[PDB]
Design an enzyme around this catalytic site. Structure first.
Site, PDB file in Angstrom:
ATOM      1  N   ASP A 188       8.249  19.271   9.719  1.00  8.11           N
ATOM      2  CA  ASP A 188       9.706  19.290   9.611  1.00  8.11           C
ATOM      3  C   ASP A 188      10.340  19.750  10.921  1.00  8.11           C
ATOM      4  OD1 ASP A 188       8.557  21.873   8.107  1.00  8.11           O
ATOM      5  OD2 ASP A 188      10.489  22.450   8.951  1.00  8.11           O
ATOM      6  N   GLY A 196      23.020  31.182   7.068  1.00  2.50           N
ATOM      7  CA  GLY A 196      22.621  29.795   6.883  1.00  2.50           C
ATOM      8  C   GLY A 196      21.806  29.627   5.619  1.00  2.50           C
ATOM      9  N   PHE A 228      13.680  26.424   1.744  1.00 10.49           N
ATOM     10  CA  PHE A 228      13.370  26.945   0.416  1.00 10.49           C
ATOM     11  C   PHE A 228      13.957  28.339   0.245  1.00 10.49           C
ATOM     12  CE2 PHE A 228       9.793  24.060   1.461  1.00 10.49           C
ATOM     13  CZ  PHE A 228      10.039  23.094   0.504  1.00 10.49           C
ATOM     14  N   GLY A 229      15.235  28.487   0.572  1.00 14.72           N
ATOM     15  CA  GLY A 229      15.903  29.758   0.381  1.00 14.72           C
ATOM     16  C   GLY A 229      17.223  29.793   1.125  1.00 14.72           C
ATOM     17  N   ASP A 230      17.874  30.950   1.045  1.00 14.50           N
ATOM     18  CA  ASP A 230      19.123  31.207   1.743  1.00 14.50           C
ATOM     19  C   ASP A 230      18.910  32.307   2.774  1.00 14.50           C
ATOM     20  OD1 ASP A 230      19.644  30.231  -1.079  1.00 14.50           O
ATOM     21  OD2 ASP A 230      21.651  29.976  -0.228  1.00 14.50           O
ATOM     22  N   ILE A 231      19.628  32.197   3.889  1.00 13.94           N
ATOM     23  CA  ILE A 231      19.443  33.073   5.040  1.00 13.94           C
ATOM     24  C   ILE A 231      20.644  34.005   5.136  1.00 13.94           C
ATOM     25  CG2 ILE A 231      18.612  33.154   7.406  1.00 13.94           C
ATOM     26  CD1 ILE A 231      16.964  31.327   5.703  1.00 13.94           C
ATOM     27  N   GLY A 236      17.973  28.029   4.312  1.00 12.76           N
ATOM     28  CA  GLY A 236      16.663  27.553   4.699  1.00 12.76           C
ATOM     29  C   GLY A 236      16.216  26.354   3.881  1.00 12.76           C
ATOM     30  N   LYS A 254      15.462  35.966   4.075  1.00 17.45           N
ATOM     31  CA  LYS A 254      15.207  34.714   3.378  1.00 17.45           C
ATOM     32  C   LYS A 254      15.034  35.025   1.898  1.00 17.45           C
ATOM     33  CE  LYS A 254      11.938  32.334   4.924  1.00 17.45           C
ATOM     34  NZ  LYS A 254      10.555  32.024   5.377  1.00 17.45           N
TER      35      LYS A 254
END
EC number: 2.7.11.1
Lengths: 951, 52, 297, 81
Positions: C128, C16, C20-23, C18, C38
């Site tokens: 959030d 997935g 402020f990033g990629d998972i 995030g 992350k």
RNA sequence: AGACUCUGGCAUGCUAUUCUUAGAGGGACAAGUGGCGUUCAG
């Protein structure tokens, strides 16, 4: 953290914030932010809005700027006064920048320019630099030049560290000034040259450099003003050896002289001799850099300001009046620069004299001779290091004139009978050989025919006289002056009239004088290669070609000799001759070949003559010769078939003329003959034949696919032929057939797929032809890189992986070459899908195959480590290879003149001089420099027979 | 019949050229080598190497 | 091979993205346990991963927080690697063909009440909160909810002087507006009251399986958020849970009327939820709809 | 191809000994290498002949004074013995 | 991206010998040409 963001003021404010409300631009932003500009002195809020105003203001609201320029001028002027009374930096700096932008885009404007100008002398560097750059951008982006020039003059006259600041202004702003203000500025600049301060001197010399470097027009600078400032600048010349200001003084005087010549050339050449004399005097400085700079400056002036006007000036003698007398005077200066007092700059002086010869000689020869005699005398020193430079200078002078004027100046003392054996001017013959290019042939006749003939006669007479030492020397002499003929044949000016006097002489010298023959042949070739530019010259060469052809044919056809140079001379010499006598000699050569009473060597020699005569004949003679040679393609002699295929290649070699017409007329006959003679072609005969096939693939029509697909196996088996030339021709023919199928269809990729599936089945049969087809695919993969479609390449690569399991070393080697080419060529993103399969096939190769092919595997692992991760290659290889891998990684860790004695060699500081003490040393003697030197004066086992033992 | 062409005679060169030309003609006239060329080449190579 | 993070973790595929990033997924090469990644680029618009590391090391120990594994910088990136977790609540919402029952939503409500208790006892707000932001455990954690993504988290109270961040208007909508509060929509400083208003919003999202302002379209993002706001004030509280127990309604009324500096009694909310749970005669057997559709297969 | 140290060394010493008896092309040079030097290797004989041929085609293009004084020096050495 | 060692193609030549042999002797040395080249190394 927030300046490097894209949303920040670094990038996006410069692009999308200028579009205010969707349209760029609106000053309603600025028209609204007067209220922050007035009665608010908060730091970092005025500075930020000033920064944004400066950044947005360049996006041309020009009619709005012209309209509300008064409002902006008043607003930013009160900002200027308030911030000057307050004393801040950043708000002042960007308000200076935005006023600079506003004044660049656009009575009161003079006031705004004065307000922008007055902050240069402000002591803060950020304010001063911004004001200076803004004034420079306003002037270069002019009615305001007079005001700022007067401001700079008054600011200098008022004042000590600000002097350098508006001198930087003057350096950046002198070209955009009017002439009277330039004159006043230069007067004030020489007034501050009356001071002895060093930094002001260097900066104002930089100002002169910027003034003269831009090459100003007549409005900015006149020729009389340039002459006056040149004469005024002679008064400083700092001392002799300062080397920081003397460099600038030479450079600005060079640029001023260049500009003066560009304005008015005759006055510039008239003023040049004083500068050349001062430069020659300045060449006595002990610094090497000033010597190199003076040499470069005088070379630049000679090349750009002196050379192109010599057709206008004409020849100069000892009684010249105009600019020719000035040229004679500065030649006199550079001639005085050759005395004994220099003795360390003679390399630079000789190089500058060399470019002087090349530029000046053709019109400066009447006065040139005394310098030539002096430099000839300089080589008589016992120890000379600039011998190569002196020889280059003598060669440049010879290239300027030729040996006639030079031998009038410095004569050869080898004219017939000499007493001693030490020829002092023996370097002149190599110089003449190396550097005659633009002379007359008649001088070569009338001087070097009787002299060389007498020396050859004397050499032979002394040879029968018992003295074998002097005879060899004289024979080497006559050989050396017989090598001057290629030099004289470079670009003669009277070869239309003087070639008649050498035709029979060159014929007899090529007939019964073997010792000259090669050079003589070279001379002929040299003449042709650059001497048939005119038409009367080529007519004379043909008129004597009709006589020279039997002589050369008999010389080539004789039994045993330099046959190959004769053959090259015949090749070019027949490309420059008329077709009818070519047809006659082709008929005679066909008679000689068809004669059964000729020996095999004679038959092969006349076949070589047929090869030479074939492309130069007409279509009827070419067709008759082709009919004669066509039965010879099935001859069992490999030499006869090789010469036959060479004839067929040479007649197909011409792209235009009778050969192309013959090919177009006999394409079907040639195709059926070459397909029929394919079965009985010998191994050397493959080398020309492919080229002939090459010469019929380039212009092949669309209805010829059967011919190409029948020629394919021969071309592949010739890609694995014994001869390297045959392999090169077969690779070129494969590339050319691939190109030929790129013309028979609309889709290039499908046509290349068809061409590949016409060569693909070679991966099926015997071992050597499998390696043949792998090498063919390896060569084709480097040429049509993406055009066949990389996925197909991948399939081919997979097939090569199966061929990586072969027992034979040739198939493995060809597979490794294909893998290397595929790694080089096709994409890494498609490699990463196929690394594992190809390198797994690499991994389970063998022990013997890995040990023998360690170079190719090492290079492949290096390429894979470069292109991918090292850990991946380590993971997928087996254990032992890992050792080599770390070494590769360690490797990637570690990656981040003509004298006998000189040739027979076992292969501060330059200012040193040696006197010699004979008569007492008279320094005032013109021939004293001969006694002043520039350099320091001064294994096997022999057998019982006396023969040496070499191991 | 050595694999290297440099050490072997020209008559056998002509015989090999004629044989490979005939084999090329037969494989070009084969219907299997008209639809999937490289697939058939891969199958033939796999069979030839599993023989080895 | 192509990339190794931490020297002992091998990277896998993306699961997935995030805030402020990629998972990504990764496997430890030493012991073989599977971790989640992350990754963020060292030059970007929001360098906030070190603050995320600080917030994760603050929130350790208690239930509902994945334990910290490693953090570092890798040759163009900064990577924070954590324990592996399961799908979020929206994945189970999609798997169940968009239907939730009373027992499952009360399990989820108790779990998110416990999560909000933990995060406000650890002196931080989320801002959030969404069903994508709450993940589900793996292994023996298969009955425990977990809270992630401290990227938009901020400090809301002080440890020593008991002081809040001062109230000030005009705050940009950092989170999503599908579950944002009225105070968050207007620009009022977000506090714990807006947090469990967002808990009530995700609760009614789970119950009704649809929102009346979901998929609303306007001229721009600000106009969309504004229109959602006035139609949120235009929507009565009781009409949002028609045919539903009034527990959710008076929960929304209670969390709406909370002040700024007040401390809510979360024990009261847990007590009321468990009273409703036992009066509808259910037990804490953890038999969720996704679980029972796994056993039905 | 490159040339080893012993080839150029033996070539230089053989020039310095017998420049007088040499020629200009590969034929005469390999002949005098046969009849002047022992040179058991034919490969090294071809190398030495080729490089002394290179030396010849280099050195008669120079001035004749050095080659001349080499001739009377070699003649003086030969007449001395 | 082997400047390590040995060595092949052609012999109508010598040896018991143009078709098979096996010892020796030859042949190739970048030797020749034209361009690029510090004008010499390449």
């Amino acid at each position: 953290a927030a300046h490097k963001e894209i949303c920040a003021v670094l990038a996006a404010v410069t692009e999308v914030i200028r579009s205010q409300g969707g349209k760029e631009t609106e000053t309603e932003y600025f028209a609204a932010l007067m209220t922050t500009m007035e009665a608010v002195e908060s730091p970092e809020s005025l500075a930020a809005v000033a920064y944004l105003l400066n950044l947005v203001l360049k996006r041309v609201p020009s009619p709005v700027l012209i309209k509300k320029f008064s409002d902006t001028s008043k607003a930013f002027m009160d900002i200027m006064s308030a911030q000057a009374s307050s004393g801040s930096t950043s708000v002042l700096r960007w308000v200076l920048s935005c006023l600079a932008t506003l004044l660049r885009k656009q009575p009161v404007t003079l006031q705004v320019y004065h307000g922008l100008l007055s902050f240069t002398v402000h002591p803060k560097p950020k304010i001063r630099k911004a004001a200076q750059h803004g004034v420079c951008s306003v002037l270069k982006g002019h009615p305001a030049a007079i005001s700022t020039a007067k401001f700079c003059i008054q600011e200098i006259e008022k004042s000590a560290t600000t002097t350098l600041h508006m001198l930087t202004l003057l350096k950046d702003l002198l070209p955009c000034f009017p002439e009277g203000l330039v004159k006043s500025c230069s007067e004030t600049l020489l007034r501050v040259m009356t001071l002895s301060h060093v930094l002001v001197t260097a900066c104002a010399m930089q100002a002169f450099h910027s003034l003269f470097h831009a090459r100003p027009g007549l409005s900015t600078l006149s020729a009389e003003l340039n002459a006056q400032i040149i004469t005024a600048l002679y008064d400083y010349v700092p001392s002799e050896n300062d080397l920081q200001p003397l460099l600038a003084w030479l450079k600005v005087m060079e640029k001023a002289h260049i500009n003066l010549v560009r304005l008015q050339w005759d006055l510039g050449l008239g003023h040049l001799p004083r500068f050349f004399g001062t430069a020659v005097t300045c060449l006595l400085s002990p610094h090497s850099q000033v010597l190199t700079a003076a040499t470069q400056s005088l070379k630049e002036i000679l090349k750009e300001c002196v050379a192109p006007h010599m057709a206008d000036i004409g020849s100069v003698t000892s009684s010249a009046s105009g600019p020719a007398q000035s040229v004679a005077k500065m030649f006199r200066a550079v001639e005085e620069g050759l005395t004994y007092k220099f003795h360390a700059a003679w390399s630079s002086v000789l190089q500058l004299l060399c470019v002087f010869f090349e530029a000046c000689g053709r019109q400066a020869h009447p006065v040139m001779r005394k310098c030539l005699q002096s430099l000839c005398d300089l080589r008589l020193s016992p120890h000379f290091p600039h011998t190569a430079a002196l020889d280059q200078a003598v060669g440049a002078a010879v290239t300027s004139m030729g040996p006639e004027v030079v031998l009038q100046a410095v004569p050869l003392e080898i004219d017939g009978s000499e007493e001693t054996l030490d020829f002092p001017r023996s370097w002149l013959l190599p110089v003449i050989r190396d550097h005659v290019q633009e002379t007359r042939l008649g001088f070569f006749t009338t001087y070097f025919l009787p002299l060389a003939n007498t020396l050859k006669s004397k050499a032979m007479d002394l040879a029968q006289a018992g003295s074998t030492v002097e005879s060899k020397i004289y024979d080497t002499l006559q050989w050396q002056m017989w090598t001057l003929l290629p030099g004289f044949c470079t670009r003669p000016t009277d070869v239309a009239i003087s070639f008649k006097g050498l035709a029979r002489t060159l014929g007899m010298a090529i007939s019964e004088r073997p010792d000259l023959r090669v050079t003589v042949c070279q001379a002929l070739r040299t003449l042709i290669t650059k001497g048939c530019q005119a038409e009367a010259d080529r007519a004379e060469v043909s008129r004597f070609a009709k006589n020279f052809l039997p002589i050369l044919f008999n010389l080539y056809g004789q039994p045993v000799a330099p046959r190959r140079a004769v053959l090259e001379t015949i090749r070019t010499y027949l490309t420059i001759t008329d077709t009818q006598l070519v047809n006659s000699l082709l008929e005679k050569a066909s008679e000689k070949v068809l004669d059964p009473a000729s020996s095999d060597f004679t038959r092969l020699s006349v076949l070589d003559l047929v090869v030479a005569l074939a492309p130069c004949a007409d279509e009827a003679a070419i067709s008759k010769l082709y009919s004669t040679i066509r039965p010879y393609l099935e001859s069992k002699a490999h030499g006869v078939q090789k010469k036959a295929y060479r004839v067929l290649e040479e007649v197909c070699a011409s792209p235009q003329g009778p050969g192309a017409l013959f090919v177009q007329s006999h394409l079907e006959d040639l195709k059926k003959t070459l397909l029929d003679s394919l079965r009985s072609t010998s191994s050397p005969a493959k080398r020309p034949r492919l080229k002939c096939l090459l010469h019929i693939v380039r212009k092949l029509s669309a209805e010829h696919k059967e011919f190409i697909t029948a020629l394919i196996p021969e071309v592949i088996l010739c890609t694995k032929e014994v001869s390297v030339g045959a392999r090169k021709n077969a690779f070129a023919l494969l590339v050319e057939m691939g190109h030929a199928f790129l013309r028979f269809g609309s889709n290039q990729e499908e046509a290349l797929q068809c061409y590949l599936v016409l060569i693909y089945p070679g991966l099926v049969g015997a071992v050597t032809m499998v390696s043949c087809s792998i090498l063919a695919l390896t060569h084709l993969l480097f040429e049509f890189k993406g055009l066949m479609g990389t996925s197909t390449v991948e399939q081919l690569l997979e097939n090569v992986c199966l061929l990586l399991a072969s027992r034979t070393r040739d198939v493995v080697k060809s597979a490794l070459g294909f893998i290397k080419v595929a790694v080089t060529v096709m994409d890494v993103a498609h490699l990463a899908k196929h690394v594992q399969l190809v390198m797994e096939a690499i991994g389970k190769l063998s022990d013997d195959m890995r040990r023998h092919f360690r170079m190719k595997l090492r290079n492949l692992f290096t390429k894979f480590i470069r292109k991918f991760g090292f850990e991946l290659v380590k993971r997928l290889l087996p254990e032992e290879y890992h050792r080599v891998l770390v070494n590769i990684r360690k490797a990637e860790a570690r990656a981040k003149g003509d004298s006998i004695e000189e040739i027979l060699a076992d292969s501060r500081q330059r200012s040193r001089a040696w006197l010699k003490e004979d008569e007492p040393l008279n320094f005032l003697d013109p021939k004293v420099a001969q006694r002043v030197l520039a350099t320091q004066p001064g294994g096997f086992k022999v057998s019982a027979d006396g023969r040496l033992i070499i191991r | 019949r050595p694999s290297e062409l440099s050490r072997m005679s020209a008559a056998q060169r002509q015989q090999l050229l004629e044989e490979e030309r005939t084999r090329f003609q037969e494989l070009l006239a084969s219907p299997a080598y008209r639809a999937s060329p490289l697939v058939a080449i891969g199958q033939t190579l796999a069979r030839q190497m599993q023989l080895e | 091979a192509e990339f190794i993070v931490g020297g002992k973790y091998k990277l896998g595929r993306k699961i997935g993205s995030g805030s402020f990033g990629d998972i990504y997924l990764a496997t430890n090469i030493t012991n073989g346990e599977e971790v989640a990644v992350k990754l963020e680029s060292q030059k970007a618009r929001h360098p906030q991963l070190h603050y995320e590391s600080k917030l994760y090391k603050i929130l350790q120990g208690g239930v509902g927080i994945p334990h910290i594994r490693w953090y570092g910088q890798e040759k163009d990136y900064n990577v924070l690697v954590m324990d592996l977790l399961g799908p979020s609540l929206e994945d189970l919402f999609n798997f169940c063909s968009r239907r939730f029952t009373m027992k499952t939503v009360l399990m989820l409500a108790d779990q998110m009440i416990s999560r909000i208790e933990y995060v406000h006892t650890k002196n931080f707000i989320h801002r959030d909160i969404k069903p994508d932001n709450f993940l589900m455990g793996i292994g023996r954690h298969c009955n425990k909810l977990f809270l992630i993504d401290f990227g938009l988290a901020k400090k809301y109270r002080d440890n020593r002087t008991r002081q809040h961040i001062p109230y000030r208007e005009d705050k940009n909508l950092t989170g999503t507006a599908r579950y944002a509060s009225i105070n968050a929509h207007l620009g009022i400083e977000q506090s714990r009251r807006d947090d469990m208003e967002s808990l009530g919003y995700v609760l009614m999202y789970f119950n009704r399986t649809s929102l009346p302002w979901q998929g609303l379209k306007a001229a721009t993002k600000k106009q969309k958020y504004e229109k959602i706001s006035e139609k949120k004030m235009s929507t009565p509280v009781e009409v949002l849970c028609k045919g539903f127990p009034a527990e959710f309604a008076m929960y929304l009324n209670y969390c709406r009327g909370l002040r700024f500096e007040e401390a809510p009694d979360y024990m009261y909310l847990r007590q009321l939820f468990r009273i409703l749970f036992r009066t509808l005669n259910h037990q804490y057997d953890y038999t969720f709809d996704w679980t029972m559709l796994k056993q039905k297969a | 191809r490159v040339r080893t140290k012993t080839v150029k060394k033996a070539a230089r010493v053989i020039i310095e000994k017998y420049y007088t008896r040499l020629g200009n092309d590969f034929h005469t040079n390999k002949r005098v290498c046969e009849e002047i030097a022992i040179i058991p290797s034919k490969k090294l004989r071809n190398k030495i002949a080729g490089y002394v041929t290179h030396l010849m085609k280099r050195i008669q293009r120079g001035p004749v004074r050095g080659i001349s004084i080499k001739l009377q020096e070699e003649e003086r050495e030969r007449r001395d013995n």
